Amino acid sequence: XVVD
Amino acid sequence: XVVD
Amino acid sequence: XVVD
Amino acid sequence: XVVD
Amino acid sequence: MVDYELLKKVVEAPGVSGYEFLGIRDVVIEEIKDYVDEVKVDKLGNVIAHKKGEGPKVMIAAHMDQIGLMVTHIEKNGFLRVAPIGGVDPKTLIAQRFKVWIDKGKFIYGVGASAPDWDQIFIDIGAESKEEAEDMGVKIGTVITWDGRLERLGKHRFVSIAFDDRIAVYTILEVAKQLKDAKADVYFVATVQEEVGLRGARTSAFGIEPDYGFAIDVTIAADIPGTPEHKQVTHLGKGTAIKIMDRSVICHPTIVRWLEELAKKHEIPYQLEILLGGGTDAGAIHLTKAGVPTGALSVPARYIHSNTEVVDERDVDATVELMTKALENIHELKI
Amino acid sequence: MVDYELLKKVVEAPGVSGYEFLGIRDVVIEEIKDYVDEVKVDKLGNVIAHKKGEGPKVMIAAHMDQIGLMVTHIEKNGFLRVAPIGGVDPKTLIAQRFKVWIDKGKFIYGVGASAPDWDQIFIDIGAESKEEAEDMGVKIGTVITWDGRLERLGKHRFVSIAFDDRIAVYTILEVAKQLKDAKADVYFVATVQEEVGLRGARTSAFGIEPDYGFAIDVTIAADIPGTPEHKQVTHLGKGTAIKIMDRSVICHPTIVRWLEELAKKHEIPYQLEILLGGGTDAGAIHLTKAGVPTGALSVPARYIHSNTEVVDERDVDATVELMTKALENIHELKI
Amino acid sequence: MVDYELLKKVVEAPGVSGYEFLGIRDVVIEEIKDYVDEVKVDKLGNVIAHKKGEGPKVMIAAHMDQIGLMVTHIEKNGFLRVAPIGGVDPKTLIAQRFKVWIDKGKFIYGVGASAPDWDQIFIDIGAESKEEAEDMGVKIGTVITWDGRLERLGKHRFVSIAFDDRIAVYTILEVAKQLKDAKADVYFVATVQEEVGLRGARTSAFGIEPDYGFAIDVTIAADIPGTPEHKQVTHLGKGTAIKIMDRSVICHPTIVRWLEELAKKHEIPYQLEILLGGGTDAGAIHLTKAGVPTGALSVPARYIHSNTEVVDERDVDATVELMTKALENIHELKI
Amino acid sequence: MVDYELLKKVVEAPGVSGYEFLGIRDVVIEEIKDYVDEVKVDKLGNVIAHKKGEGPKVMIAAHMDQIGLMVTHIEKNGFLRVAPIGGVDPKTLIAQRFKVWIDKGKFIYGVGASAPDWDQIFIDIGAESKEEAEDMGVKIGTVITWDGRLERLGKHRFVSIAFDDRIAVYTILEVAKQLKDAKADVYFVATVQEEVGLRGARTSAFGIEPDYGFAIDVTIAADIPGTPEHKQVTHLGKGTAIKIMDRSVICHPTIVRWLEELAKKHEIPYQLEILLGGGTDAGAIHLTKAGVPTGALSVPARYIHSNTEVVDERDVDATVELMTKALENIHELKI
Ligand SMILES: [Zn+2]
Ligand SMILES: [Zn+2]
Ligand SMILES: [Zn+2]
Ligand SMILES: [Zn+2]
Ligand SMILES: [Zn+2]
Ligand SMILES: [Zn+2]
Ligand SMILES: [Zn+2]
Ligand SMILES: [Zn+2]
């Protein structure tokens, strides 16, 4: 997981 | 039923 | 503590 | 300083 | 599955909070007196029906007051302004017919008119002036109820005004008729003013000083279109609802499971109830004096607090049956 | 400064409102019985520990119930829906671990997920269906608490679940251990259901009929970043808080100043407390029967009603000390 | 189905982006060294474990850094202000316990407090002043992680901090243990700083210059209440997820179908993954030098980027199995 | 405390991103050539000044490009429309004077006019038509900078256009002048296009392939009225800022503490820097090839990206001193  |  |  |  | 004629008598008798003496009181006394040892009416108007027995003193309460309206002002052109008695929603008063009570056993029709808030609501009784409205028998303080009647909906359901506990009043009348030589000192109480604060239950419980308390009332059945499954609370036809807790009371866990086990043993359909809010007579009973262990059985009902409340006879029968079994076996209960 | 092991025992025992019997009840009985003449559990579950003495009858109450959750529905895919027991804020349930109680002394883990409102909150226990969740021991009515443990924060502070009065339960246990030949007839009461309406305090006070009443609870410590100085209420480490008034009670002015003077005389650090809202057991005790003069000592606490409440041992010790001194000198109090 | 003790060791070791050397690095080296020919740590801190073999040079990356916080300022009264390391959501920091790392292998507890935005968040470590906080070992730059531990959820699931790839670190450790005489020159890489931009994967891939690249990470499992079926992405327990594409990479179609066919042939449960956003190490690996054909296997995970991430052991086992089979058969792959 | 004349030369030379060759390039070459062994200009325009030495190869980068505007269209009545070169805020262009560059070393004045967004901004150069504006030397692509000059503010501060790194260009020029027989192979680089994406730093670092990388740039000094203490980032006059991390890079922890220890040992004032966002050349340098351990020293600056940026000479001197000490001792650094 970048972002979530 | 007080309230509903 | 009722409330908080 | 990119951004500010 | 239910005594239709008796149910009709209890739901159609007028009896708004504080004014139960205008109709429902006498119906309860007349229909329960031959099944108990003594019937008394206390200070606030609660009907206390005592059935002597050898065992724990048990109070079973069902409120006989219903929500309604009270005239607050008579306009120059004869229209009536009102205040709610209990939790009345303005949306249920629009384009509705009402019974305006001018005396005990005497009413005239009225029409509700003009989301709506209270200062926009008014009742039309066909008067042309304040003087005419007064000559017709209306005054500040006149009480009003919807013009509702009991009718059947399909094979097992019904629609009516005031199921919000007249169905419980019906239930205790049936329990009183079925109870035979129970090992318990029973006090059936048709309480007053539950809709304005569980008031009658508080004073009658104080006087009775029971060992065990039970309330019978309606609970939310939101098993209707658009409602998420986890928010339905109860389902019509799935049994009497054993209350775990509502905003006014956390039923004694031992009594809750004892009732559940009794239902299983006697093959009585039941469902568990939890309400985020709401309030019931048990909320007052359990806090009486040094405390009273209490439980509550509820009749699932749709569209509560309206002229079109709906219940299922199978749940009503289950409630009568479980309460009867509870009274017959309460002498064995160990808390 | 505090008996860490004892504090850990009291804060980590489960006991949500109405279900105190599942853990905290037995801990209180076991830890206080050797310091009193008799211990009894009343109708609602209050633990009443009586220490006989010659003097005014005094009731000291600390609520043993903690806030928590109750399962209201089990979704088709095994997720649990819940209702709050007490004033729970949804923001404190997100991405948190929970102990789902399937039996007394038995729990399984759960994860809270999905500002958040109640219909958006759910608990994941690793089940794949409603049937599996039920086989794991979960049912409608299952109670849940955060998975919290007592830990130290710096030199004098601590973090824990349920300080909201388990710190007061700890306090009365310590007071009971220190009290020696006090000129007073003392009733230490670990009350039930304070979080849902000061219910246990009401019924136990009625039965005891005390001459003087005292409550020990936590109060708001908002001495944190961004809070205006006049809105901090109390400060951690600045002493036991003597309550002047909260929304539920205006402490008897004579007792308030008597406590303040006692604190000064015995060099016990203290601070004065005033709450715009909030409610405490004293709110019920003082309105018992014909009235009971009452006072309240509070332990300042940050982040109340969460799994990470914080208190300062210096304030806890001050509370134990002042309450002990109050009991030893109450025979001289003239109201 | 998984080596629980090993999983616990990898998820509970601290290692926020840029500071992996404080704990996770040594755990990876210790647990993988006996299964490879050589272990090296590069410039940025990536752990490169080389297992010599005859065949295509293959890089398998799992990031060992986890999201966390860094102290940016110490308030006058001892409270700490923080900045996120990676994509941290403020909603997951409220009323949570933290481990504030004052040295390698040394931490003190902290409490997160005060939808919330960063300038409203702060950490309480029990200090009364900036000086006391500093004496306790805190400074600007101090790193912080949630106080989370691995626990089981039901029969096949788990809850833990940092599954967001410590589950992948666990996976490559297991693959390294199972791989025997594979026809491939394998480079297992525990990459650094993936959470801040796929940084470690970029530099390690450049140095390795692989013929094929594979990333193992977690992917969104939104198979929870209220989520439309088409937005669930993956389902727990339905198999390892073969990535077709995310915002950072479009996996080589030949490798995607090759992996799918391998899963079918060896009866390994799998599901296809497509993400509208998100980023993974493959996003950096495939753009190395003249290009690297890559694929990615993901472990479905619920509640990603929190202290309560949830995975299913069946999907973890499927990932270990498929990656092992891929390495054993990659020598036949024709792109 | 600073060489005022030299600082004036570097800040007042034009050199917007991509067009550094119009002025700043030649100033850097002229002022640094006599202190290094060779000076070269690469493909993108970076100025690489090599000072041969025995030790680790070290790259020190300071970007020479400044933010500005580019003409996108000439209106019928002679007004100019523009696009930003770098992160320019429209609020800083209103009622401002500009230098419109019509050729190398040739400009005409312009006035910015008409919160403002880009389609509302325009430049007035006194032309009456598009044809006249063109005859004056303006075309699509013409670059523009503010009409700013270096001036002193009080005893230790200054105001100027482009401190956003011309102050760093000044710094490396000073370091190059002070460095004597350093045990390191030094590459001073005045990078291009940092304001549009750290572009020059990326390509020059690739070609140099350094063992260690260092960037010198300005950082946020928000120690002004109305800013919460924890959001000030750095304070003017409190020392050179050692960067722990910004959005583009997490400086190598070993280098960060090594720099901090060097500052303490040589009594050089310093402060620690953490930025939630922002980007610096180090963000590109450290990701070069197989990775480069990097650090960054920043000069605190108020009102960044405007014609009135402000710095403190004490912080500038501290930066020159610490970088010089770092280069003299880097041969001992063990990562
Ligand atoms: Zn990841
Ligand atoms: Zn992640
Ligand atoms: Zn009712
Ligand atoms: Zn009602
Ligand atoms: Zn409390
Ligand atoms: Zn509370
Ligand atoms: Zn800059
Ligand atoms: Zn800039």
Short mmCIF file of N, CA and C in Angstrom, two decimals, chain H residues 85-126:
data_model
loop_
_atom_site.label_atom_id
_atom_site.label_comp_id
_atom_site.label_asym_id
_atom_site.label_seq_id
_atom_site.Cartn_x
_atom_site.Cartn_y
_atom_site.Cartn_z
N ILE H 85 6.43 30.38 -13.89
CA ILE H 85 7.59 29.51 -14.03
C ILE H 85 7.88 29.22 -12.55
N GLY H 86 7.49 28.04 -12.10
CA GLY H 86 7.68 27.70 -10.70
C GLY H 86 6.41 28.03 -9.93
N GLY H 87 6.43 27.83 -8.62
CA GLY H 87 5.26 28.08 -7.79
C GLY H 87 5.02 29.53 -7.41
N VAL H 88 4.47 30.29 -8.34
CA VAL H 88 4.17 31.71 -8.14
C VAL H 88 2.73 31.91 -7.67
N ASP H 89 2.55 32.74 -6.64
CA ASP H 89 1.23 33.04 -6.09
C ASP H 89 0.75 34.37 -6.69
N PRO H 90 -0.41 34.37 -7.35
CA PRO H 90 -0.93 35.60 -7.95
C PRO H 90 -0.97 36.81 -7.02
N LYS H 91 -1.17 36.58 -5.72
CA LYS H 91 -1.23 37.67 -4.75
C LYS H 91 0.06 38.48 -4.68
N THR H 92 1.16 37.89 -5.15
CA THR H 92 2.45 38.57 -5.12
C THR H 92 2.78 39.31 -6.42
N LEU H 93 1.83 39.35 -7.34
CA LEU H 93 2.05 40.01 -8.63
C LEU H 93 1.28 41.30 -8.81
N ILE H 94 0.30 41.53 -7.93
CA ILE H 94 -0.55 42.71 -7.99
C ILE H 94 0.13 44.01 -7.58
N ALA H 95 0.00 45.03 -8.43
CA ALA H 95 0.59 46.34 -8.16
C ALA H 95 2.08 46.21 -7.86
N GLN H 96 2.77 45.42 -8.68
CA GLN H 96 4.20 45.18 -8.55
C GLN H 96 4.89 45.61 -9.84
N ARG H 97 6.17 45.97 -9.74
CA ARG H 97 6.95 46.34 -10.91
C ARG H 97 7.76 45.12 -11.33
N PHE H 98 7.93 44.95 -12.63
CA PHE H 98 8.65 43.81 -13.20
C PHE H 98 9.69 44.22 -14.22
N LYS H 99 10.65 43.32 -14.44
CA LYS H 99 11.67 43.51 -15.45
C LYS H 99 11.29 42.50 -16.53
N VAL H 100 10.91 43.00 -17.70
CA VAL H 100 10.54 42.14 -18.83
C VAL H 100 11.79 42.02 -19.69
N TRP H 101 12.35 40.81 -19.72
CA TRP H 101 13.59 40.58 -20.46
C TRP H 101 13.41 40.39 -21.96
N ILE H 102 13.87 41.37 -22.73
CA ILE H 102 13.75 41.31 -24.18
C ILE H 102 15.00 40.74 -24.83
N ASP H 103 16.07 40.63 -24.05
CA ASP H 103 17.32 40.08 -24.55
C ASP H 103 18.24 39.86 -23.36
N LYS H 104 19.35 39.17 -23.57
CA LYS H 104 20.29 38.96 -22.49
C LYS H 104 20.84 40.33 -22.10
N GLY H 105 20.72 40.67 -20.82
CA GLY H 105 21.20 41.96 -20.34
C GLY H 105 20.37 43.16 -20.74
N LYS H 106 19.15 42.93 -21.24
CA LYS H 106 18.27 44.02 -21.65
C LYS H 106 16.84 43.79 -21.16
N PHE H 107 16.28 44.78 -20.49
CA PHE H 107 14.91 44.67 -19.98
C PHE H 107 14.16 45.99 -20.09
N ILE H 108 12.84 45.90 -20.01
CA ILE H 108 11.98 47.08 -20.01
C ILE H 108 11.07 46.84 -18.82
N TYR H 109 10.52 47.91 -18.25
CA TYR H 109 9.65 47.75 -17.09
C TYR H 109 8.23 47.33 -17.44
N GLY H 110 7.59 46.69 -16.47
CA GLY H 110 6.22 46.24 -16.63
C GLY H 110 5.52 46.36 -15.30
N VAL H 111 4.19 46.45 -15.33
CA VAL H 111 3.39 46.57 -14.11
C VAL H 111 2.36 45.46 -14.06
N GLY H 112 2.31 44.75 -12.93
CA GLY H 112 1.33 43.68 -12.78
C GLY H 112 0.02 44.23 -12.26
N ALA H 113 -1.10 43.73 -12.78
CA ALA H 113 -2.40 44.23 -12.34
C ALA H 113 -3.51 43.19 -12.37
N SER H 114 -4.62 43.55 -11.73
CA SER H 114 -5.82 42.72 -11.61
C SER H 114 -5.57 41.36 -10.99
N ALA H 115 -9.50 36.73 -4.12
CA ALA H 115 -8.10 36.56 -4.50
C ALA H 115 -7.96 36.40 -6.01
N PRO H 116 -6.93 37.03 -6.61
CA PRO H 116 -6.68 36.96 -8.05
C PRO H 116 -6.23 35.60 -8.55
N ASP H 117 -6.72 35.22 -9.73
CA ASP H 117 -6.33 33.97 -10.35
C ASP H 117 -5.62 34.33 -11.66
N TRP H 118 -4.97 33.36 -12.28
CA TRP H 118 -4.22 33.61 -13.50
C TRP H 118 -4.93 34.25 -14.69
N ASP H 119 -6.19 33.90 -14.94
CA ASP H 119 -6.88 34.51 -16.08
C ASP H 119 -7.30 35.96 -15.81
N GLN H 120 -6.99 36.46 -14.62
CA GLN H 120 -7.32 37.84 -14.26
C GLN H 120 -6.06 38.70 -14.19
N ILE H 121 -4.90 38.06 -14.23
CA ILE H 121 -3.62 38.76 -14.16
C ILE H 121 -3.13 39.22 -15.53
N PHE H 122 -2.51 40.40 -15.59
CA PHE H 122 -1.93 40.89 -16.84
C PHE H 122 -0.79 41.85 -16.54
N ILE H 123 0.07 42.08 -17.52
CA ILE H 123 1.20 42.99 -17.35
C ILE H 123 1.06 44.15 -18.32
N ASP H 124 1.27 45.36 -17.81
CA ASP H 124 1.19 46.58 -18.61
C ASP H 124 2.62 47.07 -18.84
N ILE H 125 3.03 47.19 -20.10
CA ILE H 125 4.38 47.67 -20.41
C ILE H 125 4.33 49.01 -21.12
N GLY H 126 3.16 49.65 -21.11
CA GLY H 126 3.03 50.94 -21.76
C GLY H 126 2.79 50.89 -23.26
#
